Design a protein around this nucleic acid. Structure first.
Ligand code: ZN
Ligand code: ZN
Ligand code: ZN
Length: 84
DNA sequence: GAGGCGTGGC
DNA sequence: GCCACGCCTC
């Protein structure tokens, strides 16, 4: 698995990874936003999932030692380290 | 917090 | 391919 574009030599493990990377060279964005009047599109599926947080303000990851909640797991993981 | 992105089990 | 974990950088 290797990117065969103009000069890019980046190599990935799976083909799923390589296929996604090539979207940076083509600008293809297969993942559209179904929100009414948004029209946004993204290269990665997880990128679109985050954009839905904007419209919904959803925050599923909640700190069990606080009332705070977060949109992403890595946000909560860093907050938890603050409680030690 | 947000964006970009590398990665692995399924 | 999906999707989730999680590191990097600002
Ligand atoms: Zn490339
Ligand atoms: Zn949208
Ligand atoms: Zn907390």
């Amino acid at each position: 698995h290797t990117c065969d574009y103009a000069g890019c030599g980046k190599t990935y493990t799976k083909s799923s990874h390589l296929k996604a990377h090539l979207r940076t060279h083509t600008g293809e964005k297969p993942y559209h936003c179904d929100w009414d009047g948004c029209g946004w599109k993204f290269a990665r599926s997880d990128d679109l999932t985050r954009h839905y947080r904007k419209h919904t303000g959803h925050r599923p990851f909640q700190c069990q030692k606080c009332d705070r909640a977060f949109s992403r797991s890595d946000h909560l993981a860093l907050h938890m380290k603050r409680h030690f």
